[PDB]
Structure of MCE family protein, Intermembrane transport protein YebT chimera:
Amino acid sequence: GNTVTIDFMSADGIVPGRTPVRYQGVEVGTVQDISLSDDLRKIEVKVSIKSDMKDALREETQFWLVTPKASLAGVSGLDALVGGNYIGMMPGKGKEQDHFVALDTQPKYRLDNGDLMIHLQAPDLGSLNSGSLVYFRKIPVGKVYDYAINPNKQGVVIDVLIERRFTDLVKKGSRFWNVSGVDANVSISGAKVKLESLAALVNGAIAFDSPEESKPAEAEDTFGLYEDLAHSQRGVIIKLELPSGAGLTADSTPLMYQGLEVGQLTKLDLNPGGKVTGEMTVDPSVVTLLRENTRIELRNPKLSLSDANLSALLTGKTFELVPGDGEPRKEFVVVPGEKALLHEPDVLTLTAGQPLQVGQVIDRKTFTVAIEPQHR
Amino acid sequence: GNTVTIDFMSADGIVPGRTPVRYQGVEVGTVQDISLSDDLRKIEVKVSIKSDMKDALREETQFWLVTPKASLAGVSGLDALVGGNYIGMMPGKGKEQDHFVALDTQPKYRLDNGDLMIHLQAPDLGSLNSGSLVYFRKIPVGKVYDYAINPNKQGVVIDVLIERRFTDLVKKGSRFWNV
């Protein structure tokens, strides 16, 4: 038997007789006494310890009181209800100490086995409580270990755990995205609402994808979290100088080609001087078409006399791809749909959208007009 | 009486006196002692075993701690609340071993009877937790046994169970769909 004095702010359901000290549940000893000093909440608990553990008892040895927790966010009364309020400890590699302060709660502990620990940077936590679950193809393969705030106040650093048997799945190019919370997915001419699983909503969750070819990540390698699966899409980025984003929306405006969506505007910002600039994501399958003399034009939903297309009207403005030939390029200037004929590799320009059809008027003031290259 | 040393990462609600070792509930023995070595979470549990089971005690004999689970996803405290925290075991056809490591949780076990086991390929799991139910015309006829990831990272392999009395219902052309 030994003696250790621990300082407690509070000592709720503790009796000197039976408060068996546990280290992952193995009894290290029992409390000898509970008392207080000068009525200042310095609840001194004298504890008996088996001499086998006495050697490891050092300065960094942490202690805490476990307790049943039937609160709104807590179920950790699995053992305290049956075995009573015990206390938990963690040995430390300090030098030595006999007078201690109990930690307020149970601290997070690291398993010594071979697992993987990695860091996610995120501007915000989202609905990711400690214990939220990590998925690969909706198969749980690890969980959230802890979260904290980087020294700068402009971000959040989460550190998460991955089981041994899946340590190969995490690559350098692997992408993580949040899956948590539930919304409505309203679409025109019909709608359906399926987002996530019940646990994913109660607790929050993460999912991740691994490229086939990348190398395996390791050793607390940082990663970036994407707020949604859509933002995690692997597509190429394109910078756009715009006339004006009257109808444009940062994540709803698509890119058309051959009638199909290939790209999605991502960012839409105002630069000083009144200039508007955006950036867009494109599927790789079309990136080879992005070359010099490749023009991008904002189309407008037209009031077709023949095929009254409601969806086009509802969607509003939309871009268009029209491939060209030349060197690859990544910066583009968007042209108005009216002036599409003007910004062409071959066009007959002469010196307001009226036809000529073999051509169209470009502008008035003096009349500037254009003729197609094939009719040239 | 025998002696078996099992390594536990943690040993929460266990007492040396009454922690009856069960194999589908039949008591195989009781824990003799719980202790630790060099303070490195190698919780050594010495266990007494009835000699009848001693022969089958081999290398592949698995062990685990059952526990009440009132968490968000768990109801498996039906017996641990009444009978207390026991431990479960599965015999193995190894050679022999005396020092063991307890499995973290209760592993999935296969009934020896005549049932059917089949594999579903799916690019994603969906909301199919272990225990999700298999229907024929909304009549349950089997359940999900387990799920795993194929060696390629481009899919998921579920393996599922079908009761004996419906083994005739599954045909080569039969189609499965998620609900």
About this structure: The CA atoms of residues 75 and 97 of chain A lie 33 Å apart. Chain A touches chain B at residues 23-27, 52-53, 56, 75, 78-79, 82-83, 91, 111-112, 136-139, 169, 197-199, 202-203, 210, 212 (CB under 8 Å). DSSP finds four helices and 24 strands in chain A. The first helix of chain A runs from residue 51 to 54.
